[PDB]
Write a protein that holds these residues in place. Structure first.
Motif, mmCIF file in Angstrom:
data_model
loop_
_atom_site.group_PDB
_atom_site.id
_atom_site.type_symbol
_atom_site.label_atom_id
_atom_site.label_comp_id
_atom_site.label_asym_id
_atom_site.label_seq_id
_atom_site.Cartn_x
_atom_site.Cartn_y
_atom_site.Cartn_z
ATOM 1 N N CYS A 1 3.706 -4.327 0.318
ATOM 2 C CA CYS A 1 3.949 -5.779 0.546
ATOM 3 C C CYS A 1 3.018 -6.353 1.606
ATOM 4 O O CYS A 1 2.930 -7.583 1.697
ATOM 5 N N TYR A 2 2.360 -5.525 2.409
ATOM 6 C CA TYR A 2 1.623 -6.028 3.583
ATOM 7 C C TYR A 2 0.394 -5.162 3.802
ATOM 8 O O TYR A 2 0.475 -3.943 3.680
ATOM 9 N N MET A 3 -0.697 -5.812 4.172
ATOM 10 C CA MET A 3 -1.876 -5.137 4.754
ATOM 11 C C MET A 3 -2.243 -5.857 6.047
ATOM 12 O O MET A 3 -2.324 -7.089 6.061
ATOM 13 N N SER B 1 -15.471 -5.613 -5.179
ATOM 14 C CA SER B 1 -15.187 -7.030 -5.478
ATOM 15 C C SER B 1 -14.283 -7.536 -4.368
ATOM 16 O O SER B 1 -13.624 -6.689 -3.700
ATOM 17 N N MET B 2 -14.328 -8.839 -4.154
ATOM 18 C CA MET B 2 -13.463 -9.550 -3.199
ATOM 19 C C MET B 2 -12.350 -10.215 -3.999
ATOM 20 O O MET B 2 -12.643 -10.912 -4.988
ATOM 21 N N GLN B 3 -11.105 -9.973 -3.620
ATOM 22 C CA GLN B 3 -9.962 -10.744 -4.166
ATOM 23 C C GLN B 3 -9.256 -11.406 -2.999
ATOM 24 O O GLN B 3 -8.638 -10.661 -2.214
ATOM 25 N N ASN B 4 -9.394 -12.726 -2.864
ATOM 26 C CA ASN B 4 -8.786 -13.448 -1.721
ATOM 27 C C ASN B 4 -9.345 -12.821 -0.440
ATOM 28 O O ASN B 4 -10.589 -12.762 -0.323
ATOM 29 N N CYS B 5 -8.513 -12.288 0.457
ATOM 30 C CA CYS B 5 -8.987 -11.694 1.737
ATOM 31 C C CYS B 5 -9.000 -10.163 1.704
ATOM 32 O O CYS B 5 -9.192 -9.566 2.769
ATOM 33 N N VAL B 6 -8.923 -9.524 0.541
ATOM 34 C CA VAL B 6 -9.122 -8.047 0.507
ATOM 35 C C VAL B 6 -10.368 -7.723 -0.310
ATOM 36 O O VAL B 6 -10.781 -8.535 -1.175
ATOM 37 N N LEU B 7 -10.980 -6.592 0.008
ATOM 38 C CA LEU B 7 -11.981 -5.976 -0.887
ATOM 39 C C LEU B 7 -11.310 -4.860 -1.681
ATOM 40 O O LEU B 7 -10.430 -4.143 -1.139
ATOM 41 N N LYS B 8 -11.745 -4.730 -2.923
ATOM 42 C CA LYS B 8 -11.344 -3.655 -3.843
ATOM 43 C C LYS B 8 -12.593 -2.832 -4.085
ATOM 44 O O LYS B 8 -13.532 -3.352 -4.700
ATOM 45 N N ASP C 1 -0.587 -9.843 1.449
ATOM 46 C CA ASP C 1 -0.073 -8.922 0.407
ATOM 47 C C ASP C 1 -1.280 -8.140 -0.151
ATOM 48 O O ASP C 1 -2.425 -8.326 0.334
ATOM 49 N N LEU C 2 -1.052 -7.286 -1.144
ATOM 50 C CA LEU C 2 -2.132 -6.406 -1.646
ATOM 51 C C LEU C 2 -2.972 -7.143 -2.700
ATOM 52 O O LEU C 2 -3.987 -6.550 -3.117
ATOM 53 N N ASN D 1 -7.182 8.687 -6.849
ATOM 54 C CA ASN D 1 -6.428 9.403 -5.799
ATOM 55 C C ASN D 1 -5.437 10.332 -6.496
ATOM 56 O O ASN D 1 -4.527 9.853 -7.179
ATOM 57 N N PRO D 2 -5.541 11.669 -6.352
ATOM 58 C CA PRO D 2 -4.617 12.565 -7.049
ATOM 59 C C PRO D 2 -3.183 12.434 -6.535
ATOM 60 O O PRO D 2 -2.234 12.847 -7.216
ATOM 61 N N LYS D 3 -3.039 11.874 -5.334
ATOM 62 C CA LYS D 3 -1.722 11.727 -4.685
ATOM 63 C C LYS D 3 -1.169 10.323 -4.930
ATOM 64 O O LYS D 3 -0.169 9.974 -4.313
ATOM 65 N N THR D 4 -1.772 9.533 -5.809
ATOM 66 C CA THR D 4 -1.264 8.165 -6.055
ATOM 67 C C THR D 4 0.202 8.260 -6.471
ATOM 68 O O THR D 4 0.506 8.878 -7.498
ATOM 69 N N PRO D 5 1.139 7.626 -5.720
ATOM 70 C CA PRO D 5 2.542 7.551 -6.122
ATOM 71 C C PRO D 5 2.718 6.459 -7.172
ATOM 72 O O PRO D 5 1.826 5.658 -7.379
ATOM 73 N N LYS D 6 3.883 6.439 -7.813
ATOM 74 C CA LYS D 6 4.330 5.228 -8.532
ATOM 75 C C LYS D 6 4.289 4.089 -7.524
ATOM 76 O O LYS D 6 4.803 4.269 -6.388
ATOM 77 N N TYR D 7 3.706 2.962 -7.898
ATOM 78 C CA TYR D 7 3.575 1.841 -6.941
ATOM 79 C C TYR D 7 3.592 0.511 -7.674
ATOM 80 O O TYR D 7 3.292 0.461 -8.890
ATOM 81 N N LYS D 8 3.954 -0.511 -6.897
ATOM 82 C CA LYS D 8 3.918 -1.944 -7.232
ATOM 83 C C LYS D 8 3.273 -2.681 -6.061
ATOM 84 O O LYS D 8 3.361 -2.211 -4.920
ATOM 85 N N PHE D 9 2.653 -3.807 -6.351
ATOM 86 C CA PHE D 9 2.284 -4.791 -5.311
ATOM 87 C C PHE D 9 3.301 -5.918 -5.381
ATOM 88 O O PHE D 9 3.410 -6.528 -6.443
ATOM 89 N N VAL D 10 3.999 -6.179 -4.287
ATOM 90 C CA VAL D 10 4.996 -7.278 -4.253
ATOM 91 C C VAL D 10 4.677 -8.177 -3.064
ATOM 92 O O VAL D 10 4.178 -7.688 -2.052
ATOM 93 N N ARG D 11 4.945 -9.464 -3.222
ATOM 94 C CA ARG D 11 4.874 -10.450 -2.122
ATOM 95 C C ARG D 11 6.311 -10.697 -1.679
ATOM 96 O O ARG D 11 7.130 -11.142 -2.516
ATOM 97 N N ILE D 12 6.615 -10.350 -0.444
ATOM 98 C CA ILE D 12 7.982 -10.474 0.109
ATOM 99 C C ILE D 12 8.160 -11.886 0.668
ATOM 100 O O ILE D 12 7.169 -12.589 0.935
#
Ligand code: T8P
Ligand code: T8P
Lengths: 304, 304
Positions: free
Chosen positions: A160-162, A81-88, A176-177, A95-106
Motif C-alpha cells: 500500500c505504501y512506498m 519506465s516511469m509510472q507517476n512517481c515510481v520507476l519500474k 502507493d505502488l 524474483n524466485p521469492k515473489t509472494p502472492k501480492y496485490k497493489f492496493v491504495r488505502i
C-alpha cells in the motif's frame, strides 16, 4: 491477554527488497516477478530535487545506469519506465521469492506494517497508519526511501505504501505502488506543510474495546451519547466525525463485549473532556488511534 | 527522522516456527538444526497444570506422541528430552532454513522482538523488554506458547525468550532457550504475583536522547543533577537506580547530542516531578522505557 502494537511478520517482504543505485544515490527497490519498483527521485542530484523535470532527467538514464543488487548478486536491467512517481525496472530474472501480492491504495485511518530498509537490507518492522492528512509517522533516514508498507491476508501481501519524502516537520509522505502520492505531496524539495493531524475516532473506539477485552475497564461510565452529540465533542478535539459506517464496523467488538458503540463513544467523550487523570489504558497515557477495528479483532482472536 | 517502536525483521525466525501437538494441546516449537524446542507444559492436561510432576507425566510420552508439523509436512521425532522447563524433540531432518543462532539469557531492561505464533504460524511481531520484575508485557492468547523472543546481530539470531505463562494480572512469564524461567516464575497454575514493575531509567534516558535527535526538545531545562540526587527521585518514582555503568553506556548519545548524561537526568527528574502537562515526547504521553541505548543508536544510525 495483552495488546501490543503489532506488525505483520516481514519475511515475505524481506524476500523482495533490493538495492537500487543511480549515479551517487542508493535507496531500496521492491522486486516482484521481473519488475523492481523504486522512487523516481533515485535519478535526482540533491540539486535536481529543488525543481526536478523527471521526464527530462530520465532521458539521460539508460538501463545500465540503474544498478540493482539482490543481496550480493547483481540483477540485469532490460527495461525501465516511469509510472507517476515510481520507476519500474524490468529485470531479466523473476524474483524466485515473489509472494502472492496485490497493489492496493488505502484510505486514511487504515494501518499497515513498514519494513524499514537501507541499501536493500531490512533494519526493522513497525506498524503505521495513513493519517487523515495523508502523512505517516514513520522512522526513515537517508537510504530508507523505497521501503514499503503492506498488509498480509493469510498468504497474499497487499503493498500500500512506498516511502519517498520527509516534510520539514519530520512526518512522512509516499506513494502507493502505482506511484501516486497519498495526499497533496510531491517528490520535490519545496514548501509542503501537512494539514491538521486529526485523530482516527473509529480506531480509538476499537482500541477502547481491546482495552475492555484485556481487563482495562476504569474508563467505562454510566453515560451514553448520540453520533451528533459525540461529533460536537469530536469536532472540538480534532477527531474525525464518527459515521454510521464506523458504528457498523465496530459491531463485532460491541457484540463480543456487550458494550453498545454509543456507550463506548460516551466513555471516549468523557476521556476527551476530563483527560486520563494520570491513568493509562493498555499501557498508554494517550488515546491510541493506529489500531483499526480489523486489527483489534485479528489480534484478540489470533489470526495467522 | 521519526522514532518508532521497531522489531527486528522476523523472516529468519518465521523459518524456524513449527506446530507441536501432545494429546489435545497444540502450541509452537522452534526448529533449529535437528532439534525442536517447546514448553514442557505441552504434555499437561489443564487438570495436570495445578500441580504437574513433569518427570512423571513425561514417562507416559513416547516420540510418536509429539506431533511436529512444519507448514503442511510432518517431522519424524527420533528422540525427546526435558531440559529445565523446555522439551527438546530430536527430529530426523535438520531445518534447512536454520539461521546462524545463539541462545542468550538477557538481563532486566534488555529489549527483544517477539514473533507471536499460533499452531506454528506467525501472526505478528512486536518489541518487548525483560521487565525489572522478570515479566514481559506481551500479546499472547491460547496457542501462542512456544513463541520466541530474539535479537539479530547482522545475520545471527540470539534467541532469549520462549513464552510459557500468563499471570492472573495479564503479564507474561517464560524461559530462555535452556528452559530456565526468567524471575521466580514456574510452569504451574498457582499463586504467582509479579513484584514492582519498576521503570528502566537508562532506557528512558536513551529515549529522551532519541527525542532530542528527532526534534522533540521542549523538556530540556537549565538544570543538572548528580547520580545520588537523581536516585533519590528515581527511588520515589519506582525507577531503577542509575549507575555509573548506565552513564558510561549513554556516552555515545551524550557525545552525538552534546547533552551531558547528568543534564538529561535533570530533565527526567523535572518530568517525574512536574509531569508532561498534556505534552508528548515522540508521540508518547508517558516516559517510554523499552528502547535500550543500543536500540536508539541502531535506529538513529540505520543498521541492517
Ligand atoms: C529517502 C532516501 O532514501 N533518499 C532521499 C534522500 N537521500 C539523500 C542522501 C544523501 C544526501 O546528502 C548527503 C541527500 C539526500 C538518499 C535517498
Ligand atoms: C500458551 C499456550 O499456547 N498454551 C497454554 C494454554 N493452552 C490452553 C488451551 C486451551 C485450554 O482450554 C480450552 C486451556 C489452556 C494451550 C497452550
Amino acid at each position: 491477554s495483552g495488546f501490543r502494537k503489532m506488525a505483520f511478520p516481514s519475511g515475505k517482504v524481506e524476500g523482495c527488497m533490493v538495492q537500487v543505485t543511480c549515479g551517487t544515490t542508493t535507496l531500496n527497490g521492491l522486486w516482484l516477478d521481473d519488475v523492481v519498483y523504486c522512487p523516481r527521485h533515485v535519478i535526482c542530484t540533491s540539486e535536481d530535487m529543488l525543481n526536478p523535470n523527471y521526464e527530462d532527467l530520465l532521458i539521460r538514464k539508460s538501463n545500465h545506469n540503474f544498478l540493482v543488487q539482490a543481496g550480493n548478486v547483481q540483477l540485469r536491467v532490460i527495461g525501465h519506465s516511469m509510472q507517476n512517481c515510481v520507476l519500474k525496472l524490468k529485470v531479466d530474472t523473476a524474483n524466485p521469492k515473489t509472494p502472492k501480492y496485490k497493489f492496493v491504495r488505502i484510505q486514511p485511518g487504515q494501518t499497515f506494517s513498514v519494513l524499514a530498509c537501507y541499501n536493500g537490507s531490512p533494519s526493522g518492522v513497525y506498524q503505521c497508519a495513513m493519517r487523515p492528512n495523508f502523512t505517516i509517522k514513520g522512522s526513515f533516514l537517508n537510504g530508507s526511501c523505497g521501503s514499503v508498507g503492506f498488509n498480509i491476508d493469510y498468504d497474499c501481501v497487499s503493498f500500500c505504501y512506498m516511502h519517498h519524502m520527509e516534510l520539514p516537520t519530520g512526518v512522512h509522505a509516499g506513494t502507493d505502488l502505482e506511484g501516486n502520492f497519498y495526499g497533496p505531496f510531491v517528490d520535490r524539495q519545496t514548501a509542503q506543510a501537512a494539514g491538521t493531524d486529526t485523530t482516527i475516532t473509529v480506531n480509538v473506539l476499537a482500541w477502547l474495546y481491546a482495552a475492555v477485552i484485556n481487563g482495562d475497564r476504569w474508563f467505562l461510565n454510566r453515560f451514553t451519547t448520540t453520533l451528533n452529540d459525540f461529533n460536537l465533542v469530536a469536532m472540538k478535539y480534532n477527531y474525525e466525525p464518527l459515521t454510521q459506517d464506523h458504528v457498523d464496523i465496530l459491531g463485532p467488538l460491541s457484540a463480543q463485549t456487550g458494550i453498545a458503540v454509543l456507550d463506548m463513544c460516551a466513555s471516549l467523550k468523557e476521556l476527551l473532556q476530563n483527560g486520563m487523570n494520570g491513568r493509562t489504558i493498555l499501557g498508554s497515557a494517550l488515546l491510541e488511534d493506529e489500531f483499526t477495528p480489523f486489527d483489534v479483532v485479528r489480534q484478540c482472536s489470533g489470526v495467522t
